[PDB]
Write a protein that binds this ligand. Structure first.
Ligand code: CLA
Ligand code: CLA
Ligand code: CLA
Ligand code: CLA
Ligand code: CLA
Ligand code: CLA
Ligand code: CLA
Ligand SMILES: CCCCCCCCCCCCCCCC(=O)OC[C@H](COP(=O)(O)OC[C@@H](O)CO)OC(=O)CCCCCCCCCCCCCCC
Ligand SMILES: CC1=C(/C=C/C(C)=C/C=C/C(C)=C/C=C/C=C(C)/C=C/C=C(C)/C=C/C2=C(C)CCCC2(C)C)C(C)(C)CCC1
Ligand SMILES: CC1=C(/C=C/C(C)=C/C=C/C(C)=C/C=C/C=C(C)/C=C/C=C(C)/C=C/C2=C(C)CCCC2(C)C)C(C)(C)CCC1
Ligand SMILES: CC1=C(C/C=C(\C)CCC[C@H](C)CCC[C@H](C)CCCC(C)C)C(=O)c2ccccc2C1=O
Lengths: 69, 739, 131, 69, 108
């Protein structure tokens, strides 16, 4: 964090954790596609129901890494 | 998903007057006196007469609200009688010396001598309920705050009683609303246990933490502030543990290490109170909440994500086990009885776990030194624990009698246990006879070596040593654990594994409980009597339907008295009688567990501390050689400690002397029912109804005897009525005086 | 066959990222699918230059560091066009006519790459030096 | 401006100006609907080509109001 | 044998990846000392490459005599941690420490 903030570099750890979650938590979801769909009917390759879980899983893993380092 | 029909049950009083409306056996009229008992016995088991799985699940659902009501009525009486008639402000002035008292007694014949001098300007019955040490941690400093509560426990009792009305008389749900297990498991984990501990974590910091920073500075119950000021005056709350200057922002930028004064991992006992650090219990119920709410999102509902339990049992199957757990998810979504036994077993076994975790870790300020309560708080939940567990053996057999299905259960885990049920029982049979000789017979060897004048040839310390080498090592890793494995703790999880004697004044809060040669014996007694209590209940469940003796036991139901004098004689064969048999063994089990407590806590834990710290115990360390014999269990423990309740007439402790006497009565009064049978007495009423037919008024209700299961049932319900209440006063009087 | 049958070859949850990236995608025009690539590779390339550089602790580290990030991309769109001159000699028609087999949009790929390859680059310099 | 920042309350003036623009600059656009469409094909009742102009018009009107007060 | 290219070609990559990021970290370190820029080399007083896994392993093995190996008096060795030992006037063993220069050679 030589070019950024100390409470700004946590946001890279939290946002990677959402990508670290959904890359290997995403293909584990068995029943996908259950509603609701996206707000403006944007045909996007996941559901908001699923993607809210990944941001929830990423918020737990990111809490584990940030407090872990 | 929400699915509800409207007004299924009308609020008409016509079924109040005429009793027995619910059965098709009843609503006819008692031609015998068995109908009076047949009504009161089969009232609440709604599966007996409602043959409709939707309808029964609504009767169960509303009646739980009624049981939610009667707690809140009883929680009102714990809160109104403490605001009104207690020495609580007298207890808040001097917590150590002054014993608690609520229930002042009325001025009539001499029952007002029970209002004895307790300390302060107050006289009453010394309470052993621990509410004074409970409310002190919660922060309740004036009687007024409690006053609303009992009101809040009354109005919530009215709200639940209306909810039992509304969710059955007006809006009672569908069967498919009850079979939605994953949405129920998600909500009870997340909302009930998660938020309900999260909100208690909030109350512990906003209300219960800050005043116990001040009461433990030794100032007053008067010049300390009130709870509503702690939220508002944010610099009153920033003087004590000065970390509320930053607020909710360290919770959100994940620099949680800036809560290092009111969120702690001390892990000891608060030495100015002998109890749990509330900053530890706050960080506790915080971590319990976040664990439970995260576990509240484990199961699958109509948003795709989540574990489905039905998909988890299929593909849990093994080569030993065949089909695995297939059908077992369908068991706990069709049978309320199997759901009761499984929920009871881990409710009662939890109730013994809390009793073990309270004396080694006192949760409350000045509960540790209050030996009047800290012995009673153990012995209550141990009895409540052992009672629900025999209930778990009960309603397991009721599921097996009728709600067992062999169609759903072919070569799965329920079926194969019944297909090697002799090998389960006969191996469990052997280990009882193993643990009877090699645990109880060691006491008999300790009598026939001691009475013969050979105290070198028994099993003791100064003889053949039966050392508990495992449990002495488990203390060796649970006491070296802190800072050696658990490095962020201050001390260990408790002081019982080792450490300094912590004392409040001259009374010991907690001290390291040694295990010696006698502790190997009495623990193996407990291993013996629990394994028998398992055996009678497991024989009742595994043979609930059929055996080599009777292949139609569940055709004869759950509760039928006998199959008569046939097959050599077959009495007490049913699944009910095994619960009847297992109630005494549970009484015999926990009574040793209570005895092992009430002596080792007196002899090896509690006592008076002098100024340098040299502890002197109550009986003064006589468990280590008294408790290895049957005589020392009678001489050094039972003869020595029964003194306090028979020299108590004319005291404030005197109804203890009465209940000690009064429960010796009703215990023997059982044996009139237990050792006897029916057909003597129903023959004897022929003589007693003759006295009212000689004088021409023999009643239209034919005066009857009890049924055989009833004579068993009354006999055990009066048996446990005595032996617990015998100990209940005996424990109360002894620890009040010398403890 | 030609390929091998493991249990994880041609698995769905990795194919969902494979057939939805803006190089294997279905309907995007080769002006536009080079933008999403150039927006992607550009934003991180000013990562290493500004915290691992010759001067890191100056006015001055994000500014000069991020000149080299767009200074790298201009060597890349050069290397894209020399690939265009040498693989697409007249965009010789091939088996698929993708953006990648037969060319047909290569200097629309090249020009699309340079838009985000300067656009996303300074956006991080906005997000690093400010904000 | 009683409960916020001094350079934070400009953002209400700038973002109102985008809504002040497109409410009466929006119905003045004669040829609407010319490409490109939205990034994820979100069927939304304007085009990104049009909406970029409103944010551009809002950035000019907002510069006029902020420097005007 | 039926996937022997996937073995070798991934092994080929991790060979080249290791040569660049171990030996090329010396050629970087050669130049920044030759160009007189010791703030740019990989050292302890420079851009540090700390072996945190080999210092956590060296930590947990040196704090095991008494926690997880109680009946051991001292540790498994004095190479993980602890006091030095002398015989005569020469050292028998002392904790071999692992810094940026030890990370740099262990990857070679
Ligand atoms: C009059 C102005 C106006 C305002 C202030 C809102 C406000 C909102 N819209 Mg709506 N909407 C509007 C008109 C408006 N709408 C019009 C005219 C359309 C058609 C072009 C939409 C099409 C639309 C969709 C498809 C969705 C919203 C959504 C929302 C909510 C999310 C925040 C947001 O992005 O808003 C800016 C917010 C309450 C989201 C929503 O439904 O929230 C529940 C959403 O999914 N809007
Ligand atoms: C998350 C919110 C929430 C909370 C706080 C509760 C709390 C409770 N429920 Mg649960 N329950 C919930 C959601 C919730 N429920 C949902 C969404 C369903 C349907 C899937 C249920 C289905 C349910 C049943 C069938 C029963 C309870 C019961 C209970 C009570 C347990 C007794 C006790 O410990 O006190 C407790 C009040 C029991 C009860 O005693 O009801 C009065 C009971 O029998 N609940
Ligand atoms: C569900 C339980 C619960 C409830 C109802 C509250 C409620 C409150 N908290 Mg508390 N809090 C809780 C759990 C809870 N907290 C827990 C578990 C912690 C430890 C992480 C805290 C640590 C905390 C801090 C540091 C502060 C609050 C504060 C507050 C008050 C204002 C919060 C706000 O509006 O912003 C509000 C009364 C704020 C306050 O007013 O403190 C006096 C505040 O500064 N809380
Ligand atoms: C204190 C009186 C008493 C005693 C000694 C027993 C003894 C026993 N009960 Mg019984 N029980 C009792 C009261 C008693 N019960 C009462 C009042 C009830 C009514 C509720 C029951 C209901 C009950 C049920 C429902 C069950 C038992 C079972 C058992 C057996 C358990 C296994 C065992 O320990 O074997 C070892 C034996 C002993 C510990 C007995 C003492 C033996 C001494 C110490 C050793 C012998 C000395 C010497 C070698 C003898 C030979 C010499 C001599 C002949 C000259 C054991 C024989 C269970 C069973 O049978 O499981 C297999 C069982 O399921 N009992
Ligand atoms: C002989 C020709 C030559 C020249 C003049 C340079 C010059 C430079 N190299 Mg060196 N380098 C060269 C050959 C050359 N190199 C060769 C052949 C190799 C392989 C062995 C290297 C390996 C090497 C590495 C690993 C590094 C350098 C770095 C540097 C720079 C150090 C100062 C600096 O960054 O200011 C700070 C100023 C900036 C970072 C911005 C300066 C302007 C940039 C380069 C261009 C901005 C965009 C511009 C408008 C268009 C692109 C330019 C391009 C078309 C020429 C300096 C620009 C260091 C560096 O910082 O890389 C950028 C660096 O890490 N070089
Ligand atoms: C592998 C991860 C990945 C990354 C980092 C990007 C990055 C990007 N995507 Mg792409 N995209 C991806 C995979 C990815 N994409 C996948 C798997 C899908 C299908 C679900 C899409 C569907 C998609 C659409 C429809 C659009 C983007 C767009 C974008 C750009 C805008 C910023 C953004 O919101 O990204 C997060 C950015 C370069 C926008 C774009 O095209 O920019 C030119 C856009 O309109 N993405
Ligand atoms: C010191 C002399 C030397 C060097 C540098 C090499 C280098 C290599 N050998 Mg070779 N080898 C050698 C002697 C050497 N060998 C000898 C004497 C034998 C006879 C026994 C062999 C037999 C041998 C076999 C059998 C194999 C190798 C393989 C390799 C490669 C290993 C992977 C790697 O590290 O890539 C990364 C490259 C390096 C670490 C080289 C140094 C690069 C520097 C640090 C970076 C470049 C700086 C700058 C950017 C350069 C350009 C500047 C300019 C454009 C301005 C590597 C290229 C193996 C291979 O090919 O695996 C894939 C292999 O299997 N070699
Ligand atoms: C204990 C080891 C054990 O549990 O083994 C596990 C074994 C079952 O193993 P499987 O993997 O075959 O069973 C899978 C199922 O248990 C889960 O569906 O159970 C038995 O052997 C019963 C043990 C009876 C008691 C024997 C003593
Ligand atoms: C951790 C992890 C991960 C991740 C990573 C990665 C993958 C990353 C990447 C990321 C990235 C790579 C990102 C991106 C972003 C971008 C951005 C966000 C940018 C922006 C841009 C823009 C903004 C542009 C535009 C423009 C132009 C073009 C021109 C004009 C103007 C402007 C500037 C507007 C994974 C999943 C592997 C796995 C697990 C772990
Ligand atoms: C449910 C929920 C949620 C969500 C929510 C949200 C987040 C919201 C937001 C909000 C928002 C974000 C909103 C906004 C809105 C706005 C408005 C309300 C506006 C209005 C205005 C107007 C309209 C004006 C304008 C104008 C002008 C200025 C001038 C010209 C004309 C006009 C008129 C146009 C959350 C997540 C929390 C959680 C859970 C619950
Ligand atoms: C004594 C005895 C009886 C006889 C006892 C009976 C039938 C109970 C009679 C006593 C009860 C308590 C009488 C009920 C009292 C009236 C209800 C009084 C009404 C007055 C109002 C004011 C309440 C059995 O029936 C029996 C059956 C099986 C095994 C053992 C026994 C057994 O030992």
């Amino acid at each position: 964090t030589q070019s950024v903030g100390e409470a700004a570099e946590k946001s890279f750890v939290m946002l990677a954790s959402v990508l670290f979650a959904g890359a290997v938590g995403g293909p584990g979801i068995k029943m996908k596609g259950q509603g609701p769909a996206w707000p403006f009917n944007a045909q996007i390759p996941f559901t908001p129901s699923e993607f809210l879980a990944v941001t929830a899983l990423g918020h737990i893993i990111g809490t584990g890494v940030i407090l872990g380092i | 998903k929400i699915v509800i029909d409207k007004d299924p049950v009308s609020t008409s009083f016509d079924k109040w007057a005429v009793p027995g409306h619910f059965s098709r056996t009843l609503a006819k009229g008692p031609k015998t006196t068995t109908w009076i008992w047949n009504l009161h016995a089969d009232v609440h088991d709604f599966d007996s007469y409602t043959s409709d799985l939707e309808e029964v699940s609504r009767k169960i659902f509303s009646a739980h609200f009624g049981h939610l009501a009667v707690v809140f009525i009883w929680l009102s009486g714990a809160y109104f009688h403490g605001a009104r008639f207690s020495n609580y402000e007298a207890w808040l002035s001097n917590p150590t010396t002054i014993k608690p008292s609520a229930q002042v007694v009325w001025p009539i014949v001499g029952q007002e001598i029970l209002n004895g001098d307790v300390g302060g300007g107050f006289q009453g019955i010394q309470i052993t309920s621990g509410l004074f040490q409970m409310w002190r941690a919660s922060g309740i400093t004036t009687e007024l705050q409690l006053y609303v509560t009992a009101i809040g426990a009354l109005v919530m009792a009215a709200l639940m009683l209306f909810a039992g009305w509304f969710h059955y008389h007006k809006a009672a749900p569908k069967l498919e609303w009850f079979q939605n297990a994953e949405s129920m498991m998600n909500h009870h984990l997340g909302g009930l246990f998660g938020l309900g501990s999260l909100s208690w974590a909030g109350h512990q910091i906003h209300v219960s933490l800050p005043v116990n920073k001040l009461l433990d500075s030794g100032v007053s119950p008067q010049e300390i502030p009130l709870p509503h000021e702690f939220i508002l005056n944010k610099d009153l709350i920033a003087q004590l543990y000065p970390s509320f200057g930053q607020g909710l922002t360290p919770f959100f930028t994940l620099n949680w290490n800036e809560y290092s004064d009111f969120l702690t991992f001390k892990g000891g006992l608060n030495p100015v109170t002998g109890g749990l650090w509330l900053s530890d219990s706050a960080h506790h119920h915080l971590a319990i909440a976040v664990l439970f709410i995260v576990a509240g999102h484990m199961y699958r509902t109509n948003w795709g994500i989540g574990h489905s339990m039905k998909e988890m049992y299929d593909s849990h199957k093994g080569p030993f086990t065949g089909e695995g757990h297939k059908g077992v998810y369908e068991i706990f979504t069709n049978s309320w009885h199997a759901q009761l036994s499984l929920n009871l077993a881990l409710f009662g076994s939890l109730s013994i776990i809390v009793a073990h975790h309270m004396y080694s870790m006192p949760p409350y300020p000045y509960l540790a030194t209050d030996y009047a309560t800290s012995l009673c708080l153990f012995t209550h939940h141990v009895w409540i624990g052992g009672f629900l567990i025999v209930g778990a053996g009960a309603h397991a057999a009721i599921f097996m009698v009728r709600d067992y299905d062999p169609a759903q259960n072919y070569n799965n885990l329920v079926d194969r246990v019944l297909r090697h049920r002799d090998a389960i029982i006969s191996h469990l049979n052997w280990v009882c006879i193993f643990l009877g000789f090699h645990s109880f017979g060691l006491y008999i060897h300790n009598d026939t070596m001691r009475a013969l004048g050979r105290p070198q040839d028994m099993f003791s310390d100064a003889a053949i040593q039966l050392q508990p080498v495992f449990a002495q090592w488990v203390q060796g890793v649970n006491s070296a654990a802190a800072g050696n494995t658990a490095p962020n703790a201050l001390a260990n999880a408790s002081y019982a594994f080792g450490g300094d004697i912590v004392s409040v004044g001259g009374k010991v809060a907690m001290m390291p409980i040694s295990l010696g040669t006698a502790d190997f014996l009495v623990h193996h007694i407990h291993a013996f009597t629990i394994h028998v209590t398992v055996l009678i209940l497991l024989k009742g469940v595994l043979f609930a339907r059929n055996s080599r003796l009777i292949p139609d036991k569940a055709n004869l139901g759950f509760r039928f008295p006998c199959d008569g004098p046939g097959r050599g004689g077959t009495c007490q064969v049913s699944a009910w009688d095994h619960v009847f048999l297992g109630l005494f063994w549970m009484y015999n089990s926990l009574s040793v567990v209570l005895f092992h407590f009430s002596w080792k806590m007196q002899s090896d834990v509690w006592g008076n501390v002098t100024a340098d710290g040299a502890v002197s115990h109550i009986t003064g360390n006589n468990f280590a050689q008294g408790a290895i014999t049957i005589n020392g269990w009678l001489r050094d423990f039972l003869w020595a400690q029964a003194s306090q309740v028979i020299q108590s007439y004319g005291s404030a402790l005197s109804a203890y002397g009465l209940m000690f006497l009064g429960a010796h009565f009703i215990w023997a009064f059982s044996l009139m029912f237990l050792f006897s049978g029916r057909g003597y007495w129903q023959e004897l009423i022929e003589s007693i109804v003759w006295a009212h037919n000689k004088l021409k008024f023999a009643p239209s209700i034919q005066p009857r005897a009890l049924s055989i299961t009833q004579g068993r049932a009354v006999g055990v319900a009066h048996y446990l009525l005595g032996g617990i209440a015998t100990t209940w006063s005996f424990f109360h009087a002894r620890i009040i005086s010398v403890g | 066959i030609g390929h091998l049958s493991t249990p994880i070859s041609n698995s769905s949850a990795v194919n969902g990222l494979l057939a939805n990236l803006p190089a294997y995608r279905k309907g995007l025009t080769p002006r536009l699918r080079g933008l999403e690539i150039g927006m992607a590779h550009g934003y991180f390339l000013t990562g290493p230059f500004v915290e691992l550089g010759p001067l890191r602790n100056t006015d001055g580290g994000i500014l000069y560091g991020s000149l080299s990030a767009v200074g790298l991309v201009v060597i890349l769109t050069a290397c894209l066009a020399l690939y265009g001159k040498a693989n697409f000699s007249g965009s010789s028609k091939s088996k698929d006519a993708t953006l990648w087999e037969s060319g047909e949009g290569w200097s629309d790929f090249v020009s699309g790459w340079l838009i985000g390859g300067a656009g996303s680059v300074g956006f991080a310099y906005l997000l690093l030096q400010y904000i």
